[PDB]
Structure 1
Amino acid sequence: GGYAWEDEIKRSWDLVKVASLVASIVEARKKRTAKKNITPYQRGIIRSLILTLDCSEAMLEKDLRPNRHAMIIQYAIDFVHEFFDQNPISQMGIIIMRNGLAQLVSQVSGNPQDHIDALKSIRKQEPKGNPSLQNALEMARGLLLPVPAHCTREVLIVFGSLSTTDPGDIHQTIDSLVSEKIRVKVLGLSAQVAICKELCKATNYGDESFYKILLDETHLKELFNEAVTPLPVNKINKGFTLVKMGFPTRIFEDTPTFCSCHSKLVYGGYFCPNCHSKVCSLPTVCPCCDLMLILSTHLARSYHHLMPLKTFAEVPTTEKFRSEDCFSCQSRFPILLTSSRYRCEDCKQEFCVDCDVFIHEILHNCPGCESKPV
C-alpha cells in the first residue's frame, strides 16, 4: 500500500527533449474548398428582426469575461452597428427576458441610434429572475404583426438558461409562429435545449443549422456576425411584390425649420417627393404619406448579396503563370515548391492572397473582370 512518494520522481525535465511551407498552403487550399460552393441564392434584403436577449439568473455566471450579461450586451451594441451598416433599409426591435416576463426596450424602427441608447441603458441593470421563451416569442409575434408582407420577419434569440418557465403551452406558440411565417434563430450559451431545437427546426422548414451553441468567446463573435447577412428565402414561400418608395433630394437652407418627424428645428433635411415634408435622416418612413424614403446608395449596398462574386480557385504549380506580380496590387509573389497565385475564372487573372481576401470581403467586384472589354 505504498504511496506515490515512494514510487519515483516525476522528472519533468525528461518530458521535454531537444514541407513546413507546404503545410501553410494546403490549409489555405482546403479552406478555399469550403468557400468554393457559392451560388446566387435568393435573399430577403428587407428584414424585420426582433432581437431577444436573455437577462436572468443564469446570465450571472462567470464563464464569459466579465459575465454573460455584460458581454452579450457589449456584443449586442456591436451587432446593431454592423447590422444597419449592411442592411440600411431594414428595421430592428429589442426585447429582453426578466423575472419571467418579456420587457420591450426598443420599438421596431430604422434608426440605429435609438437601439444603441436602449442597449446601453440595459447594460446597467443587474439581471435576475427566470427566463420565459413564450413571453418573449408572444411579444415578438405582436411586434412583427404591423409589418408588410414583403419584409422578412425574423427573431434572433440569445438564450443562456437550460430551463424555461412559461405560463402557457409553448408548442401552440411555435405553431402560431410557423403560421405567421416568422423565422427564429437561437444562439445558446451552455448546451442544447429540446424546445429551442424544435423551435429553430420547425420554424425554418426543418433546417437544424439555425440553433448554434458557442465554444468560446471568439466563436461567439463569429455567430453574432453571421446573423447580419440576409437569410435566404424558401422556394415555396413566395411573396413577390412591388414596394412604393421615393428618392428625396437633399436641401441646404439658410434658416432652421421644423421637422415633420420630431417637430424639432433642424437646419437641413431631405424633402419627400410625395408631400414635400422634410425628414432629418434616412432611411425612414415618411411621417405624413407613409412612403419609404431612401437614397440610391442604400439600394446599392445590397447588390453584392444578389450577384455574389464567384470564388477564386487555386492554380496548380504544374502549369506556367502569366505574370510575376499581382494584377491589382503588383505584390511580388514569393517563390517559396508551391504557388500562391489565385486566378479568377471569369477573367483568368492572377491575384495575390492579400487581394483575394480583400476583394471578397471589402470590395465586391473583381478588378480584372471590370477591366476586360467584352
Structure 2
Amino acid sequence: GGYAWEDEIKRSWDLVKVASLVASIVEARKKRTAKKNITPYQRGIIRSLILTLDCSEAMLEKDLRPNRHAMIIQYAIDFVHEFFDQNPISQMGIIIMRNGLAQLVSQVSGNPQDHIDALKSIRKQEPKGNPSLQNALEMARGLLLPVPAHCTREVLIVFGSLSTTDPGDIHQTIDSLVSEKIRVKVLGLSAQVAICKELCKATNYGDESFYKILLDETHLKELFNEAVTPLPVNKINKGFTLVKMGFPTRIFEDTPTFCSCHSKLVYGGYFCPNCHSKVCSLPTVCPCCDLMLILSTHLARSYHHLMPLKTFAEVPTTEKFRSEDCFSCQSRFPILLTSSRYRCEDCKQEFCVDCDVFIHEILHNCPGCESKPV
C-alpha cells in the first residue's frame, strides 16, 4: 500500500527533449474548399429582424469574461452597427427575456441610433429570473405583424440558459410562427436544447443549420457577423411584389425649419418627392405619405449579394504564370514550393493573397473584369 512518494521522482525535464509555408497553403486550400462553392442564391434584401437577448441568472456565469451579459450586450452593439451598414433598408427590434417575462426595449424601426441607445441602457440592468422563449416569441410575433408583407420576418434569439419556463404550450407558438412565415435563428451558449432545435428546424423549412452553439469567445463574433447577411428563400415560398418608393433631394436652407418626423428645428433635411415634407435622416418611411424614402446608394450596397463575385482558384505550380507581379496592387509573388497566384476565371488574371481576401470581402468587383474591354 505504498504511496506515490515512494515510487519514483517525476523527472519533468525528461519529458522535454532536444514545412510551415506549405502547411499554410494546404490549410488555406482546405479553408478555400468551403468557399469554392458559391451560387447567386436569391436573398431578401428588405428584412425585419427582432433581436431577442437572454437576461437571466444564466447570464451571471463567468464562462465569457467578464460575464455573459456584458459580452452579449457589447457584441450586440457591434451587430447593430454592422447590420444597418450592410442592410440600410431593413428595420430591427430588440427584446429581452428577464424575470420570466419578455420586455420590449425598442420599437421596431429603421434607426440604428435608437437600437444602440436601448442596448446601452440595458448595460447596467442586472439579469435575474428565468428565461421564457414563448413570451419572447409571442412578443416577437406581435411586433412582426404590422411589417409589410414583402419584408421577410426574422427572429435572432440569443439563448444562454438550458431550461425554459413557459406559461403555455410552446409547441403551439412554433406552429403559429410557421403560419406567419417567421424564421428563427438561435445562438446557444452552453449546450443543445430540444425545444430550441425544434423551433429552428420547424421555422427554417426543416433546415437544422440555423441552431448554433459557440465553443469559445472568438466563435461568438463569427456567429454574430454571419447573421448580418440576408438569408436565402425557398422556391415554394412566393413573395414577389413591387414596393413604391422615392428618392428625395438634399435641400440646403439658411433658416432652420420644423421636421415632420420629430417636429424639431433642423438646419437641413431631405424633401419628400410626394408631399414635400422634410425628414431629418434617411432611410426612413415618410412621416406623412408613408412611402419609404431612400438614396440610390442604399440600393447599391445590396447589389453584391445578388451577384456575388466567383471565388478564385489557385493556379497549379507547373503551369506558367501570366506575369511576375500582381495585376491590381503590383506586389511581386514570392519565389518560395507552391506558387501563390490566384487567377479570376472570367478574365484569367493572377492576384495575390491580399487581393484575394480584399476582392471578396470589401471590394466587390474584380479589377481585371472591369478592365477587360468587351
Fold match (TM-score > 0.5): yes
Residue 196 of structure 1 deviates from its aligned partner by 0.2
Cα deviation digits, residues 67-101 of structure 1 (max 9, x gap) = 00011001111110000000000000000001110
Deviations 1:164-201 (A, max 9, x none): 00001000000000000000000000000100000000
Q: Distance in 1 between matches of 2:151 and 2:257?
A: 33
Secondary structure at the aligned position of 2:106 is classed as strand
Question: Over residues 90-132 of structure 1, what are the superposed CA-to-partner deviations in whole Å (9 max), with x where a residue is unaligned?
Answer: 0000000011100000101000000011000000010000100
SS in 1 for 2:36: coil
Shift of 1:23: 1.5
Query: For 1:337 and 1:48, how far apart are their aligned partners in 2?
Result: 50
TM-score (norm 2): 0.99
> For the residues of structure 1 that align with 2:300 and 2:206, how far apart are their CA atoms?
33
CA-CA distance at 1:19 after TM superposition: 3.2
Deviation at 1:21, TM superposition (A): 2.2
Per the alignment, residue 124 of structure 2 pairs with 124
For residues 304-329 of structure 1, give each alpha carbon's deviation from its aligned partner in whole angstroms, at most 9, with x where no partner exists.
00000000001000111110000000
CA deviation digits over 1:139-176, x for unaligned, max 9? 00000000111101000000011000000100000000
- Structure 1 CA distance for aligned equivalents of residues 21 and 287 of structure 2: 61
CA distance in 1 between partners of 2:186 and 2:269 (Å) = 39
Matched residue, 1:300: 300
Q: Which residue of 1 aligns with 2:10?
A: 10
What does the per-residue CA deviation read over 1:34-77, in whole Å, with 9 as the maximum and x for residues that have no partner? 10000000000001000000000111101111000011001111
In the TM superposition, what whole-angstrom CA distance separates every residue of 1:225-274 from its partner, at most 9, and x where no partner exists? 00000000111001100000000000000000000010000000000000
**1:48 aligned counterpart, secondary structure:** strand
Please state how far the C-alpha of 1:26 moved relative to its aligned partner.
Answer: 1.1
Aligned-partner Cα distance in 2 for 1:111–1:20? 48
**Number of aligned pairs?**
374
- What are the residue-to-residue correspondences of 1:190-269 with 2, within 5 Å? 190-269=190-269
1:291-370 map, 5 Å: 291-370=291-370
Q: Is the partner of 1:73 in helix, strand or coil?
A: helix
User: Counterparts of 2:255 and 2:287 in 1: how far apart (Å)?
Assistant: 22
Q: Per-residue deviation at 1:134?
A: 0.4
Q: CA deviation at 1:348?
A: 0.1
Q: Secondary structure at the match of 1:285?
A: coil
Alpha-carbon distance between aligned partners in 2 of 1:326 and 1:54, rounded to the nearest angstrom: 48
The CA distance in 1 between the partners of 2:172 and 2:253, in whole Å, is 55
Correspondence for 1:83: 83
CA distance in 2 between counterparts of 1:214 and 1:19 reads 32
1:291 & 1:211 partners in 2: Cα distance? Answer: 36
Deviation at 1:28, TM superposition (A): 1.4
What is the distance in 2 between the residues matched to 1:134 and 1:237?
25
Q: Distance in 2 between matches of 1:245 and 1:49?
A: 21
SS in 1 for 2:52: strand
SS where residue 273 of structure 1 aligns? coil
Give the Å deviation of 1:32: 1.4
Identity of aligned residues (%): 100
Give the deviation of 1:20 after TM superposition: 3.1
Unaligned runs of 5+ in 1: none
3-state SS of paired residue (1:2): coil
CA distance in structure 1 between the partners assigned to 2:337 and 2:229 by the alignment: 38
